[PDB]
Design a protein around this ligand. Structure first.
Ligand code: FPS
Ligand code: FPS
Ligand code: IPE
Ligand code: IPE
Ligand code: MG
Ligand code: MG
Lengths: 328, 192, 328, 192
């Protein structure tokens, strides 16, 4: 009955305050752990399903706020593998509610082509009802090639499972001769998670007031600004999001410094580890550690170029296996 | 004496963290080893079994002995392998880099035909993720103005409660213990 | 009868042309292989000794030209160990001529203190007549602490002997525990030659037209501009020196580029060789090549600081042994 | 045929270098391996026993085989271990750095109490200065506009005659042979 986004324009104060923060560093990607749907239903004295139903309305409301603020990529936590342990009523109800919107998204296609909405559902989707997986794939398949903005729905997802699958993909590449165990790198692992196409979130917003990540983007939100707001998700307001963007701008200087240093340190550490591997090979086989042959320097340039070859080739097969989803 | 009072304080809390995480995001100046050590012994007295110290620059990992010495100082004044076990000083590579290590090991056992990729279960990786003799942290105290974990054991903080204090410099027991009350009242529904 | 320098001012054209080249890169140190004294005597139909005697007059003339051009440090080849194989008449005559000037230099002392002339005789002086060594030392001892300009007389010198002595000084330091064999470096060797106080010459001028270095500053003149002029030394003119400074200015761009690259390459090569030594020690003794302990980085900083300690300490004893020349 | 003519050319010269040195100072562009190789075989034909190739960047040491291949090409067309012996490609560290090596060795034998510092004679170091099976160069051909040895075997050029040609690119036999006449007329008095 309701599509995935709303057309509401910003208000005077909302547009004025927006123009103000937009002068500073804005987040390119915000992540949301939509928590509090059930607690909100109790205070409102409404059925649990209606709480979750309102939660979706808010997700569409919040997405438009993001687009109005220029935040073009949004990742959300919609269903956890853990949530499979709730009552059948609630779990079936959440599946039903998913089937309704994913079907309406296809009915409201072309409107998705209108705004370049790339819907990407991320998770261990093989645990979902077969019907729901086909709807998901159908949606994901049509909204692919769209690039005006990006929404990542995390249905039946846990970060540990995403990390472990990404490890499996790397061991698979070793099993097929596409990878050697030495090639497994933090960067390589990054290109194996479900979020391989999405940059690491700038902000991580959890509502309800819980101060835990509940197994969500643990790898990705390492240097993300963690915003924990007491508001129950179905009551989220533009100003709640505003405050979150504020907390990001406050720390952005030090956050970005720490990010660059981690990256610069990581590169130095590998270059030292690589030079040692080249040194261990050159110390053996007789040879000379340096000299003018620049033998270590030439051997290093090859090891890197051959490193990418196996890795870049492996990534092509992973994506081909990924794009092998004629399940639509 | 005062040892029993601190043990009673921890016993009265509805819950105590078995593994404590002290994350210092402050980088304006060098950390205060005394204030750090003072927190550590507090954890030991209230009854925290494991305490992990973390900073993004690795200053603690560099000056490990300076901390362990400071710990033993407070540990005796107004309070060996006894603390080297529970106290573990960490750095960024204890997280993502260690997860990479574990992949490199399993990718190798897979390549050795000894293990199959289909056997890289979540629980399997966890065991392979340097479980050692430490459980996953359940309470992290984030000291600083930065609102980030700065890469503290990302695999293990999956359900950790993250409490923030404005600075660790000149920290006070009431400040540290008020954090423990907060965790004690925190509700974990485990997705149910 | 003649002192070691002359007071002649520059001429109009000489001063004009001088002001012109002085706009460009000037050499800080010029080296002279005063060749052709004997051939010049034959053309002039004069005794060989008079040729050498004129040669000294020219050395004083040329030194003033250098001072007038701002070139403050000059090294000259005056007597080679090889020249000991000439006829006794000529060899004794050269010694006599040396004894005369070195004695007059002391008689014309204070005038040496006037212009801060630091006379430094460099060579294997233990092969000279005892009288001549005392005159040399006497001269060298008085003109020390003088810094307005520097003249290095190479009497009874060969570069191979200077290099070998410098090696001996380093092996001596090893014998006394002042040095380890690993410390022996190109820089360390530089601080062990007789020219340890003198920068490497910018120009190397040999007269007579021979295109050979005849065992002169081989180590030092590696990247020096080699000027070979046909003029016989006792006929050397200001313009001869001018032309030599011209040849230097032509190549100075590429000469200095090559010098800096050699230096930058040498440093990189050691840093690679040192990192390998630190890696070989860290690969052994268990340990970890990198990590966050920055153990390799800390170990490297110590190895360098301890490297200088042994080297810088060794140099103090070499100079004390050197300054132990109460032979004056 | 032409081999005998080149052998006669070298035989007629009053003197021939036993060891030839080819120093390229030119660095505006990559050296011409053909022109280099063409000089080398000329040396072999006129009767030069050893030929050493040198550049400050070490380009030749890097692309050794590219030269040796080019040599063998000319060496057969219009003319193994046969050239690898006489032809030695050098770099800056074949000089001062090698002298440092020799010191490091003797300092070690001194430290081993096997040798005494007082035994570091000039002739002793020379033998220790990688004499190998090569005599000291007696004729160096300096190709380029720079007027410097750029650090070519400083210990060994003590009495070497240094002849300069403006470029090695498109070099000609008459240019190369006119240099040999110059050396042939050069007078070495050996300080006497
Ligand atoms: C993507 C799509 C079409 C639908 C899914 C998105 C919607 C509408 C709801 C998410 C369902 C869940 C598990 C929300 C967690 S809040 P909670 O259950 O933890 O409430 P509580 O914290 O217990 O108060
Ligand atoms: C320092 C001092 C007070 C006196 C010494 C300086 C003087 C006056 C002469 C140097 C003596 C020699 C050996 C000159 C070499 S020229 P040559 O003998 O090679 O002549 P040639 O090349 O054979 O024509
Ligand atoms: C879809 C979502 C947002 C799952 C995580 O929220 P939870 O409510 O399950 O996290 P807990 O508070 O139960 O630990
Ligand atoms: C004092 C000097 C200048 C000795 C070197 O000149 P030589 O005249 O001895 O060099 P050769 O030409 O004899 O080789
Ligand atoms: Mg919840
Ligand atoms: Mg001579």
């Amino acid at each position: 009955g309701m599509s995935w986004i709303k057309e509401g324009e910003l208000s005077l104060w909302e547009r004025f305050c927006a123009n103000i923060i937009k002068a500073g560093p804005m987040p390119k990607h915000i992540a949301f752990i939509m928590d509090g749907n059930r607690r909100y239903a109790k205070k409102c004295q409404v059925e649990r399903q209606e709480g979750h139903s309102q939660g979706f309305n808010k997700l569409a409301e919040t997405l438009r706020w993001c687009l109005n603020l220029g935040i073009l990529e949004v990742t959300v936590y919609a269903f956890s593998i853990e949530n499979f342990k709730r009552s059948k009523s609630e779990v079936d109800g959440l599946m039903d509610l998913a089937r309704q919107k994913f079907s309406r998204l296809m009915e409201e296609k072309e409107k998705l082509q209108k705004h370049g909405v790339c819907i990407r559902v991320l998770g261990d989707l093989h645990l979902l009802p077969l019907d729901l997986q086909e709807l998901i794939a159908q949606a994901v398949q049509a909204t692919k090639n769209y690039n005006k903005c990006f929404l990542n729905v995390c249905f039946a997802y846990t970060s540990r499972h995403e990390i472990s699958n990404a490890v499996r993909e790397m061991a698979w590449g070793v099993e097929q001769g596409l990878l050697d165990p030495s090639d497994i790198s933090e960067s390589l692992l990054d290109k194996c998670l479900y979020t391989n196409r999405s940059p690491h979130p700038d902000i991580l917003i959890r509502t309800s007031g819980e101060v835990r990540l509940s197994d969500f983007l643990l790898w990705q939100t390492s240097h993300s600004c963690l915003v924990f707001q007491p508001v129950l998700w179905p009551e989220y307001t533009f100003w709640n999001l505003f405050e979150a963007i504020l907390q990001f701008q406050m720390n952005h200087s030090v956050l970005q410094k720490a990010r660059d240093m981690y990256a610069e340190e990581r590169k130095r550490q590998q270059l030292e580890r690589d030079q040692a591997t080249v040194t261990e090979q050159l110390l053996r086989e007789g040879l000379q550690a340096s000299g003018d042959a620049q033998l270590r320097r030439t051997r290093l340039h090859k090891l890197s170029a051959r490193r990418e070859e196996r890795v870049q080739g492996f990534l092509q097969a992973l994506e081909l296996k990924r794009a092998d989803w004629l399940a639509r | 004496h005062h040892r029993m009072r601190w043990r009673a304080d921890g016993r009265s809390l509805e819950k105590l963290p078995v593994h404590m995480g002290l994350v210092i995001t402050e980088v304006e100046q060098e950390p205060s080893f005394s204030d750090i050590a003072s927190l550590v012994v507090w954890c030991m007295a209230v009854g925290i079994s494991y305490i992990s110290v973390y900073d993004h620059q690795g200053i603690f990992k560099r000056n490990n002995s300076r901390l362990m010495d400071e710990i033993l100082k407070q540990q005796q004044e107004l309070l060996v392998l006894n603390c080297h076990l529970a106290v573990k000083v960490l750095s960024p590579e204890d997280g993502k880099a260690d997860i990479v290590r574990a992949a490199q090991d399993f990718c190798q056992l897979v390549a050795q035909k000894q293990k199959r990729p289909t056997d890289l279960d979540v629980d399997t990786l966890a065991s392979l993720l340097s479980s050692n003799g430490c459980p996953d942290p359940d309470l992290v105290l984030k000291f600083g103005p930065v609102d980030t974990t700065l890469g503290f054991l990302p695999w293990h903080i999956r359900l950790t409660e993250i409490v923030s204090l404005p600075s660790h410099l000149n920290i006070s027991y009431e400040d540290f213990f008020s954090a423990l009350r907060q965790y004690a009242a925190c509700e974990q529904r485990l997705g149910k």
